[model samples]
Target: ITGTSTVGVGRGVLGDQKNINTTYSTYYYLQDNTRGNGIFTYDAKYRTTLPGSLWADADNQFFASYDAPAVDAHYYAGVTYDYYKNVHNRLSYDGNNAAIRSSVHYSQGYNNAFWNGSQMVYGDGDGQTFIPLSGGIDVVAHELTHAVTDYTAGLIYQNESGAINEAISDIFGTLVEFYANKNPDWEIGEDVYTPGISGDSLRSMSDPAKYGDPDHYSKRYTGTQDNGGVHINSGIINKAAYLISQGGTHYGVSVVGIGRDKLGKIFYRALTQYLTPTSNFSQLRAAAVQSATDLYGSTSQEVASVKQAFDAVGVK
Candidate 1:
């Protein structure tokens, strides 16, 4: 594990070539020491194991089909770290400099990626449903954002709190995408999800109702499935976040756009300083309003926009 820091050229699952941070001893390894303690990427080898092996390449060039996931996992983790650090002045995941680790090619034809409360795990999708999920920078950032939420808000992963957790991930994930300036949009998992389908995504922030998700509190799913509809009902908060940044009319209510930077500042302040584990939709609305007021004052348009956004989504 001890080696000199180096850089390697690689092509990711999407066939985009870029340089990745690595470590060099005899062979190049997917270990970046530039951020925090380090960003280490591993290969699962299509097995149901955790952190199977440290990804190593004989040469510093990664172009093999099997190496695609590893490349993106490593590269995207760095970008996500930079997004938090450079944009928000936060360290890796936690305020302290913690090592970021990720494992790719987890399970054969696995269809999902998640943060297991410790590190990131990415699945090489079944090709029809997805490609390697890490290929999508937003997907990578979304999973990593879970780690961020865990350390900060610690929002419970169920019911309204869980939906808030999910929506926060979507919000920052989209922000990271925009920060990268790579054909960014408010759609999640659009790049690597369902290659056969064009202009589709796992979820939509601009219009959560596009995929039958709730854009208003009155339409929330109240069942027990999906951890009390954590993913399903996140649409409500997602819509609120979208409206805060972009502004829109929904269900006869309108919001004024305050831009993404202010939106992120308010939300980040709420996540780090105001929210609690069991905070629900109403609680989140208050947190956001307070955060916006703290940053831009009670009568500021930024504060008003935050209130109007949540109100438009029926959060209060």
Candidate 2:
């Protein structure tokens, strides 16, 4: 949820805009053993919690049935919230007045956790490859960001729009991971999936081409697979953002890239304010420079760095 627009909250709160603690989490199934008890708002979806114990079979191993489930879900929710507030200055899910909710212990042996419009719902992993989907802050951020994107651009979940949406979330999610300073290798989803066996890293921000997977924008860089190969093709965009933040040339030359904070701020502005629903890579490149120009004036180094980054990728 990093870089979500705060325009919904407006400026200065009528006049003073006093900083109030507007953070809350909804966990309605306190004692109920059955499922589908609570309701929460995420964006376009009004999430209704369902029973997850259905998946609790002997097949599961990696998920916790009690405390760990809730803790993991809650912790990531907080992390996702914090990422938006700290990096983008967004208050909550709506950027106005709404508390995000999360439900755990959902469906036994469910391997994936995702957002269903209103709140995040997690399935206890099969305990073989993945842990609680909420175990990683980036995963939480990634899913919550889907809600954010849905609210804003509602980018179609196919073709270029889908790729852009996935890339946008992955960009922020990877940054959130780095922001936490976990292991510092630029690998996404390290904590969620066990390393070594399954090369399913979800995606890589540093170098997407290195994953040895066949998809869009690989070492050969194709443009197909998984919803425009969104999950795979996103590596190009992710690497672009990383270069802007970390500073380096596409060719690994000694050109100076903008520092991380500056790049994040510039893109935050671009994503929220300038980007339209149909915005593509070309538009995004221009919008980023425009954001930099508006914020730091025309001749700033940040603007130049962002412009160069767009070209570094295949964007004109």
Candidate 3:
């Protein structure tokens, strides 16, 4: 909606305070014009309808309890947009300054969130399991990266390919978290995953085994559920990504860290330039190696580190 841009302050589901961009005409709307084409957030109002309605407020200040999800959803989307454009020199999810959209408060006791192909959808979790998922920047970035994958690699969402798709989202999600420098870690959705649980997350890249996820290729799931265990098997690739950024030893295999910046550069290049819809783990290894070579030369430490990280995760 056409209105003057304004700043609104509010707390997230976890009680972290942040400022959000809103538009003001008669009422404040969750629309940010500073990033990309725009960042718009909606209110699902505990219903199944998608993108339910544009969130509105009576004044520019947003401190009500009901406004928490929209505040974080809108603000986090802007942070993700900045991460892509500023860090990677990419426009938006589509490399064309595409508008980013999200809907929060999806359902009563809803426990999950997703991209839904076009826009982001978040559920107010069953408090015990999760709060408002959009409250976590990593969760928000993870879902938005799905749109990024859709536009770039178009990786098929099944079997090994689907695992790659899932891993790409996890990889960039963590990178965006680090880029924001918000007490970053290699964990996914730690902030809003479980309100009752402390020091636990939906997934852990630093130690996938911490949650029964495979940190090695030998343990890859072959079941038919979850689109060939896209979430379960993503741990393997996530481990490789973690090792590439932060060196570690696993099962007697060691990887030398190349740092987060180089890891992101290599992965972004691979995602945009080298991957295909059906690319699997092996193909992903090749893509990363090639990407690192392109950025830092075949003989550079970056290329060697990429190779070692995949090897450490048993991808080769």
Candidate 4:
């Protein structure tokens, strides 16, 4: 809907106060026009519909309990967009400034969120497993990074390729988390998982096995469930990424830290340039090695650390 652009004040699902870009016509709608084509957030209204309704408020102040998810989804989408543009020099998920759209409050007790090949759909959770998923910047970035992957690598969402895809999202999502400078950690979804459980997260990059995700290729799940363990095997790659950025020793192998920016640079370059649909873990290792070599030279420590990180993860 066409309207005058405006800014609104809102409280997210975590009760954090922030400013959100909105549009003013009859009502204030959560359509941020400052970035790309737009970042439009909608209300799923506890149903499974896609992009249900353009979130609207009578006043440009979103304080109601129901407005929480919309606030974070819209705000976090903008942060992710900023991360791509400023950190990686990418315009949007497609590199063409595509409009980012998302829907929140989807389904009754829905425990997950996803990028359904188009827009974002976030579940409100059962209040036990998760709250509004948009509450976690890492979760929002994780889902939106799927859009980035779909537009770039187009990695097939199954088997090793799928695990690489999942790992890419987790890597970039964690990068985005650090970029935003919130309560940053190598853990994924800690801010929104299991409200009663303190210091726990869905997955850990520094230590994936804390949540039972495999940190080594030798321990990777081979079962057909979870699309050949896309989420499970992702730990192997995630640990490698953590090792590259922060440096760590795992299973008798040690990686020298190249820091987060270089880690992001190498991975972003690999995702946008070298990776493809069927690429597997070994291919990902080659991609990262080549990516690091390209950015930091073949003899550079960045390249060596990339190699060592994958070596530590048993990716060869």
Candidate 5:
């Protein structure tokens, strides 16, 4: 089953139109291969660290525009690989050990990172307000997540689907940070940003209320800012995942960054194993509850709490 193309994640619709021609490219990095049409290959055993780059052959080149330092690209790629592996037991993007190509230092002072359906691309920062995009592990994973979203629900990038897409990225990206101890201070990229940049984060998961311009899921949420504030309104689901994964209320306990290892694994399982593209909040709640029962057993509080947590976030 594992060897067959139809036996893996997204197997339900590998032949779908949207899933086709989904290739990736990078500016610069190390180790590249072309194993399958849908999956790329990388020799992570070589370096496996942050800010690294890997890509498939053919359309998935390592240098889409420019190249990043090998060691830095290797480190960046390694963090993303480790995050998915340790938390979700996912072998790679496709669960088929698919290659994850990336480009580093793409375009001068680009100041952004993105996963364009197949691979990740990072830019060298302007060196004033921020650093290189690949400098943050969470940011790396956040971009890769765009690929995951496309593969999964294919959330329309214009409405709540767009916001949900961004939210899921934040959820997983935050977990990647926590898993790597990227920042002990609990901020997204405290080390990657300039000093005295009071909360000028890409997105905030702790308290969306603190940042006022655009509230998560607020009436102001619209299809304007960055493809309808996919980056802006993502705070809602990001916070929801934070609260649920940590257990109880945010103020209830010290909030030890949540037992992300366990909860994230469950969420990934439900998403890839059970959810459909059309799934919304109610469907997600049911799927997550079912996933909890499958993993933690029906009698366990873990299962009950999983559902309760979803409800607490207004998913009932």
Candidate 6:
């Protein structure tokens, strides 16, 4: 919209107060002119249509119950953009400053959020299962990282490749959560999943088996469901990533902790430089190892940990 940039006070889906960037034309619009080309947020209005409308406010204050999803979607998209630019030195998902767009209130009782190639779409969940997905910064980053993957690795979303794609999202998603320093945990989606259940998440990086996912290659699912077990088999890769950063002994294989920063650096490098659309688990191990070597050297402990983490997960 044609307007000057301004700031607005708003309450997010989690009931936390945050300031969001807006465009002040006739009304306050949730179009942030701060990052990249711009970060624009839209309202789906509980229907299936996408990028419904640029969220507008009569007043600059966004405390209304209906405004929570838009506030967080807009705010957190900025946070994820900041994380990539500041942490990875990437301008945006495309390495060019592509504009980021999101739409909330996707459908009635919709329980998920996704990046639909062009933009992000968030579902306002049924109150019990979820409130609003944009409430969790990890969820926002997770969806955005899909855009990164699409622009970079372009990993095929099926079988082992799909699992790697999913794990990459989980990896960056949790890293972004910690980057923001918000109740950081090795668990995925804990902040906005199952409002009634306290210690449960959609998945776990530290231990994927907690939700009956495979933590080792030998234990991987061979079922046809979930796009050849994209979500289920990703547990194996997720556990490996956690072990690389946090250090752990699994199946008698011990890995040295490399910390989250290096973990992110190595994966970002791998995704942007080494990984391909058809890359599998062994290929991913190679990509990570090469990425670590590129960043930390051939004989560096970072490279060693990459080898150990993959071995620990039985990726060989």
Residue pairs with colliding backbones in model 6 are none
Model 6, 233-275: lDDT tens digits are 9999999999999998999999999999999999999999999
TM-scores of the models, in the order given: 0.99, 0.74, 0.98, 0.99, 0.69, 0.99
Q: Residue-wise lDDT of candidate 2 within 1-316, one digit each (tens)?
A: 1111111111110121111112122221222111122122221111234533221112112232343455445445556677777778886656763556667656666677777787678765676666666666677778778877777666677655677787888777776776777654466676767534565575677666677432223242345566666676566677777777776656543335777677778777887888777776677778888999998889988777776666666666
Better of 1 and 2 by TM-score: 1
Task: Tally clashes: model 6.
Answer: 0
Better model by TM-score: candidate 2 vs candidate 3: 3
The lDDT, on a scale of 0 to 1, for candidate 5 is 0.55
> Candidate 5, TM-score vs. the true structure?
0.69
RMSD of each: 0.6, 10.4, 0.9, 0.6, 10.7, 0.7
Q: List, residue by residue over 126-153, the lDDT tens digit for candidate 4.
A: 9899988999999999999999999999
The stretch of ten residues in a row with the least summed lDDT in candidate 2 is: 5-14
Which residue runs of candidate 5 sit more than 4 Å off their true CA positions? Answer: 1-29, 32-70, 184-186, 194-200, 213-223, 248-258
- Ten contiguous residues minimizing lDDT sum, candidate 3: 58-67
| Residues 207-304 of candidate 3: C-alpha lDDT, one tens digit per residue | 99999889899999999999999999999999999999999887888789988888889999999999999999999999999999999999999998
lDDT of 4 at 258: 87
Off by over 4 Å in 1: none
What does candidate 1's lDDT look like per residue over 64-102, in tens digits?
Answer: 999999999999999999999998999999989899999
Residue pairs in candidate 3 whose N, alpha carbon or C atoms collide under 3 angstroms = none
Residue 145 displacement in candidate 2 (angstroms): 1.3
